[PDB]
Design a protein around this ligand. Sequence first.
Ligand SMILES: [Cl-]
Ligand SMILES: [Cl-]
Ligand SMILES: [Cl-]
Ligand code: NA
Length: 129
Amino acid sequence: KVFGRCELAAAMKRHGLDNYRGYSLGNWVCAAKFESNFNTQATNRNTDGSTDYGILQINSRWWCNDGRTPGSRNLCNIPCSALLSSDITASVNCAKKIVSDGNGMNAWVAWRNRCKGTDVQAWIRGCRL
Ligand SMILES: [Cl-]
Ligand SMILES: [Cl-]
Ligand SMILES: [Cl-]
Ligand code: NA
């Protein structure tokens, strides 16, 4: 599924991400924009053999099981394919764990490089939320 901007904002709010760990909804929408361009089916291989999955590009090195990432963990206790669903519940639940892990949203390198410090409210501009 490719979400629209406000559509995703609303779904993230619906699943309790708005202001989760103090990160406003625009931060989460911005992260999704630059991780996946709002496409729930996005997958990208990392040079080390792990893969990133879904709207927030969650990495099989730590967070989900894909069966092909040696030595990895599965701290969200989910198959990585669950992170590709149209329904964003599994990605949101796992992202809540990731952002609680100590470094906040810096876990998403694209968020640090492209969202952090910027006018992230622009991402929810005009949205009926
Ligand atoms: Cl594995
Ligand atoms: Cl959803
Ligand atoms: Cl933080
Ligand atoms: Na894994």
